[PDB]
Amino acid sequence: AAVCDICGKGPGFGKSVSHSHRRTSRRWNPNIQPVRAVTRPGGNKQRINACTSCIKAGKVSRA
């Protein structure tokens, strides 16, 4: 739920900064949604994980 099967997005790593400026490690996870990909318009759906960026760009077809 952090690596897209199409674009290979990865979770960015960073430091959460508090009011007292205490740096604590954390990650920025991609918005990766479960999608039923229809590779061929015939209509056999396969289950994959695709980032919300790839859905918007139309890289996966839900037919």
Partner RNA sequence: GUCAACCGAGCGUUGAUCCGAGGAUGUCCGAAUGGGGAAACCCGGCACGAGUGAUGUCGUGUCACCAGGCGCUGAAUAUAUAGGCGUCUGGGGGGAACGCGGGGAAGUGAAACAUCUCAGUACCCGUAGGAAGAGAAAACAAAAUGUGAUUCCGUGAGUAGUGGCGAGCGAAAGCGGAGGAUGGCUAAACCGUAUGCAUGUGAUACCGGGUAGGGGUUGUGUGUGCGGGGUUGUGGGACCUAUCUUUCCGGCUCUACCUGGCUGGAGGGCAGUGAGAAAAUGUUGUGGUUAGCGGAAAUGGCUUGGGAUGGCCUGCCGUAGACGGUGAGAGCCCGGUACGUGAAAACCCGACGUCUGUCUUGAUGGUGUUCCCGAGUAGCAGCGGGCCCGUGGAAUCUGCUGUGAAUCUGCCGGGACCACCCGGUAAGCCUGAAUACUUCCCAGUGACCGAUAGCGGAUUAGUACCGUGAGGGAAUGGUGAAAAGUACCCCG
Partner RNA sequence: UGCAUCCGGUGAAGCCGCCGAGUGAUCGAGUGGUGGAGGGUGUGGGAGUGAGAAUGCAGGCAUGAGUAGCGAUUAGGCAAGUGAGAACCUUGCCCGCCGAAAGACCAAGGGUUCCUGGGCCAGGCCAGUCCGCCCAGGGUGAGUCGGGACCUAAGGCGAGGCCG
Partner RNA sequence: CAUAUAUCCUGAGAGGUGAUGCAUAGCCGAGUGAGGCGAAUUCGGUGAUCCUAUGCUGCCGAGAAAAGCCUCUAGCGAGGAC
9 binding RNA? (CB under 7 A): yes
Which two structure tokens, joined as six digits, stand for 16? 């959460």
Q: How far is CA 19 from the centre of its chain?
A: 30
Residue 55, Cβ neighbours under 10 Å: how many?
A: 17
Among 12, 36, 61, 63, binds RNA (CB under 7 A): 12
- The answer to whether 32 and 52 have CB atoms below 8 angstroms apart is yes
15 binding RNA? (CB under 7 A): yes
2 binding RNA? (CB under 7 A): yes
**Under the rule (CB under 7 A), what is the footprint of RNA?**
1-2, 9-17, 20-23, 25, 28-31, 40, 42-44, 49, 51-53, 56-57
